[model samples]
Target chain A: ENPWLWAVLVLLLALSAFFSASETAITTLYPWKLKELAESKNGPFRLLAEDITRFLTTILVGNNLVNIAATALATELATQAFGSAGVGVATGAMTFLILFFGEITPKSLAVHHAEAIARLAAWPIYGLSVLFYPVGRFFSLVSGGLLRLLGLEPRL
Target chain B: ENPWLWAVLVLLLALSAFFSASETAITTLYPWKLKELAESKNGPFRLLAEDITRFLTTILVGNNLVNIAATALATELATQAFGSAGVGVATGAMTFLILFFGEITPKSLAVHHAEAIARLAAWPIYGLSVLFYPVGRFFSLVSGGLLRLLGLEPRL
Candidate 1:
């Protein structure tokens, strides 16, 4: 049972990592390159180029939600296993895991292979954007407000 | 005493956010633009353009170190005040603060005003990069390893 629980936690962490990587990957893509890819292929690249704002919204929402959920769940699991001290342990573990595996490692890959990864993750992310449109829209509003606060045009 | 502790925690969090913003701002600058700035002026922009890899290495190292230290400090402070529940509170507060003020808002501003912010922040960040070069070099190695794992050159 403990092993299975850990497995589930790891899976959630991996999913969170995927979303994080995809976010970084998609963001790293050049607009002109995306446009060129879109013209040639009616695949994920096209979807990404055609609706960058929506894609970005979806990526942001998806990455944060998954990360928050994973961390919360990890904390809960760690607490159940080891009492209050588990919070510290969970924090350390999650920070290391999420930062290394979920963030920098995947992001590095996405930095170089953005086009390929975007193509692979595009369809599911689009569906996720549609499914989470309401939440994503809320995030968009928050983002827009933040951008405006910084004197930006809120193009995203 | 407790209030003072919290104040320190908040200050550290803000500092972490500043480093985060500076990192994003510096990275968002275009090479060509930096080159243009370098030619027109003799300042931090020139230094940044002259040694892109070292600057990036410094920025990444500085940002992560500050963020991790701040979070750890915040967690300790919160725990001392509110027990284990403080962990959750710290996580929530830091997430909101870092994401909004640290990451997105500043990055948005940087994307728009890269040159100006780059000029403004160049000296301090350059100094930081130099001060943190040893640590930054370590991070650069790790980054290079990750890039190699993903079948790409470690340009940064």
Candidate 2:
């Protein structure tokens, strides 16, 4: 039995964490800090930050896609190990791991180190944005429309 | 042959909608409006609004409780008609109704007629808050603690 498959699962989880941490920092970090980043002659975080709509939407799409693939993989491996009830076990475990590791933990880390993490992840996050521009745009339109119906301005 | 249970289910659904609509107005309506309401010297919405942390938490508890009760009731009756898979049908239906009726529609209405709804529902919302204060404070503590972990301040 190959253990490499396990590595792939863990790798997906880490990527999920990166998306959560970076997005949370982009959202929660102070506007003053973002302004300072913009003043620096070389700043992608600020450039990317302006379109908060994009990265946030991109992650909604990105996070769920990976989560599903990962969940599907988990369902399979879990079934192999535990039989009929394994899928149930897998669902609960996957939910907790995603909530704790992929979401809350890294996001909590970003709160304290917001600017630092944003500065580091700037390029990769932008790359994901460019790669998923059409995807995010369409989603944001739907979201913004719903908000509008509710008498609120559009948001990420 | 008891059709009254259906009425109870629908009644629960409507209450869930009221909670969503009122809470959305308390949250989304303009601060200027809230200020004016206070100037009237007879504003329960504002008095309660200041402690927004409570209502949002209250509803997180309230909404889920009614939803569960409704869903449980639906699942049982559905099984009487459709066999075991009735639960599957009940789940998908209950989820959609809550999203459409209990959540988006009324919240969207509040976005447009915010103050009116706030004026109308202030008493009931406040009553719910009073009944559930201890419950809300406890939950807010949990949510706030998690948000604090992310280098952000707490919220309900």
Candidate 3:
């Protein structure tokens, strides 16, 4: 009946799903790649890669949880308020929030504890990885196409 | 004026304002304290404090911004929708957004780039601080008393 609304809703829902899925994917991918580089006798590259991977993974997961939680609540409430129009407001508000909070604040803190938190959350996050597999698959498919369209490889 | 409606409005408004003010105060205070510790020949403690401070601050700022933006838009829409009853939804929604976006995301990002972004935004945010000085002072007076009553500090 309302394809337009469905399209918009699907896009937003997909984005929400994407952030969660990526959190799991990137963390796992980083360590795997680093181990490979280490085994390959990459020495300096290995250490650098290992540290970067750990750092990025920790930041990604912690930030995603926060982002998803805020976005979901904001979108849900705004939708209730003014339907589709409210989605626009939610989008704007969410954008601002994500940039300032999710990106800036957490990243700053990560500078201080990236190594520690990475060590701490690594196993737990990996432990929770099972819960995200199916969701991750969906995101992979979505991200594959989106990445290709943007002329980037899904592998990279 | 309807007393019940006025009461509800005031409550919602106060809640919204409190969320915003608390978030701002907490983020600034934590990092500032950590910086002080760092200056006082506390290298290891400085690192620890920096990490934790960054982590918390990121979550607070990113999540708060999203919470506030979403809540602000939603509250406005709700006031136009279900009238007074909607103010409660607006307040809760804003609080949620703030925690998730303003506090979480930015803090997370700050984990990596706290110094850079903090330095970048310092002057601008300081201007915002000055511009909102009157409003901040009023809120400080109100919340300051609550803070003292809770035995935290005489002024927040």
Off by over 4 Å in 1: A1-9, A27-29, A36-43, A61-99, A111-116, A130-156, B27-29, B69-92, B111-116, B131-156
TM-score: which is higher, 1 or 3?
A: 1
Q: Estimate the lDDT of model 3.
A: 0.45
Which portions of model 2 miss their true places by more than 4 Å?
Answer: A142-156, B1-156
For each candidate, C-alpha RMSD in Å? Answer: 5.4, 8.6, 15.4
- Model 1, position B13: C-alpha lDDT score: 58
Write down the TM-score of every candidate.
Answer: 0.68, 0.54, 0.30
For candidate 3 chain A, the 10 contiguous residues with the lowest summed lDDT are A104-113
Error of 2 at A76 (Å): 1.9
Residue pairs of candidate 1 with colliding backbone atoms: none
Best by lDDT: 1
Residue A95 displacement (Å), model 2: 1.7
- Give the candidate number with the greatest DockQ: 1
Q: In every candidate, what fraction of the native interface contacts is reproduced?
A: 0.12, 0.00, 0.00
Q: Model-by-model lDDT, in order?
A: 0.66, 0.65, 0.45
Which 10-residue span in candidate 1 chain A carries the lowest summed lDDT?
A64-73
lDDT of 3 by residue, A1-156 (tens): 246644544454444334333333334446665466456762433443445434334334434444444554555557666766775677676665454334433333333333343444445544444444333344435545554565543333
